[PDB]
Design a protein around this ligand. Sequence first.
Ligand code: NA
Ligand code: NA
Lengths: 313, 312
Amino acid sequence: MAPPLVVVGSANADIYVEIERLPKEGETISAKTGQTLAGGKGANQAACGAKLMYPTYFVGRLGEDAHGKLIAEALGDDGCGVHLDYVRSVNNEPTGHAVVMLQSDGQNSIIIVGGANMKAWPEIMSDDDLEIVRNAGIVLLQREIPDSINIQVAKAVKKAGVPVILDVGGMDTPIPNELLDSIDILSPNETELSRLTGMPTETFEQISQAVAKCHKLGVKQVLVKLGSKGSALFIQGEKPIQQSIIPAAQVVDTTGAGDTFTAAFAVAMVEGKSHEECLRFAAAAASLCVQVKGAIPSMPDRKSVLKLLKFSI
Amino acid sequence: MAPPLVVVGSANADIYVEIERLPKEGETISAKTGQTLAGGKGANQAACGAKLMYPTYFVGRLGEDAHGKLIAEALGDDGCGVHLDYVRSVNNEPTGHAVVMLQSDGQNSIIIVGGANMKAWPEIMSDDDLEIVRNAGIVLLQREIPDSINIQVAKAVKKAGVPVILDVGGMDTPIPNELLDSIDILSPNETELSRLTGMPTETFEQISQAVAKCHKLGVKQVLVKLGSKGSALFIQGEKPIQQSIIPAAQVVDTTGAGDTFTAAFAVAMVEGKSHEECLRFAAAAASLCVQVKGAIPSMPDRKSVLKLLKFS
Ligand code: NA
Ligand code: NA
């Protein structure tokens, strides 16, 4: 086959509940409604690539439970078409999940259980496992699995010569410099970029400043996601490429948009498109993503993204 | 071949998370651990009956989602052996669930989602559903599905001459007297019994008067659950029969104990056992249940209960 998109990272059951207010301590309240959906930044990114019709493998750890089966079904042959050969399930850990509480004011609130995502990985990565990443055309990581696993994967691709992208989404902890040294593209949003470098990110000069610091952490390319403000690709020693959002007819649900943007950029990149085309393609995929409820259900197919591109730029 | 226990009621995914503190608006936190378990009063009582090796059907409503599969796997062929022929799944409602957030203290914050338990039932019960209850040996109800459904069931079985037990656990609203008039045995705890009578229940005598006020509105039998104090069966026209707890060597988890007690009581009763023997059977089941963490996993098989009944 063509050199595959290989995603190593998390899979979550997202437990959404609609409440009026957050419950007080010791207090029992009722929710209006609820929904449980397949998610996790890793599974999201893999679903995205598969829907865009690029050969995609997901490397992850699931529990042997209902939440785990939910994931496999959404991603697999009856869903997005992700190759699940390297997903392993354990019986001593639960599939990771997130209780997402949508209050009536408009904000969100999240409790995350690491589960298999954080606990079912081996101390040392098997060669059998590392062979898929060694055959990748491009590798995507996030920060919802252990740093140790991320580092071992990145290093295994370094000694293989193929792009490794690290989405900063996930844990709010500082990134191991050992990890930064081993990736090709860093991909943060505004807060993550700010939190990471400590520097303000309210303005483009400020953002460029924060990126300059990323360059000094050893990262040659930074793909900054600015939400409504668009995106930019910074390549050390070159002029930044900026891309505004592709406006959506209706913003229904932004869940998974960051994941969509990153995975679509990766597909465009591994297909050999120019950096400008990559940013445009990613922006169009993200634009479609936000018009449908749910992360994985909202992943657009390639022809829709290309159609939006034709008529938006 | 024996006329089945038929449980009509709720099924819930219980989502337990151990956390340091509660999150705030626009915030993400992480939990120590987390586990999602099959529960709900209807599903618990059905599981108990099946695990007691008595033919048991569960009539309930699920969502077409992972939590629905979780329930069905816990209850069905690969689990407790409940007959799930009358469980229906819908695609426009989630399986009922509760998010239980255990904080560092001992303080619990809970969110309840009614889901299909409250919203997936029909306006009028199908004749299929009413057929299984009309063919029942005994029918168990609770208050975690709409009153309308409980009433239509209770009327059908009264017609068929089938005993009905109504567990008061669930909603904290008052019980419609149309429901009270159609059930054979009402089954509250000391706290629920006080809430629907207005009277106090800290003393035995106060309980007997509240129960006297249950005979008021047409309830001929009351099975009161008293936790550590045991239980009492009040049948109007007879004298209060009692059973203290069969002492547990070690109490690990009392979740589902009331459910186990009620279902085991129903199994003993439908098997033709005497009222005294019924209470003892239920007490023994409840005793084994509290020695294991969880609700469904702690349900004892018939052999464990019958081995414990050989003792004192
Ligand atoms: Na979406
Ligand atoms: Na228990």
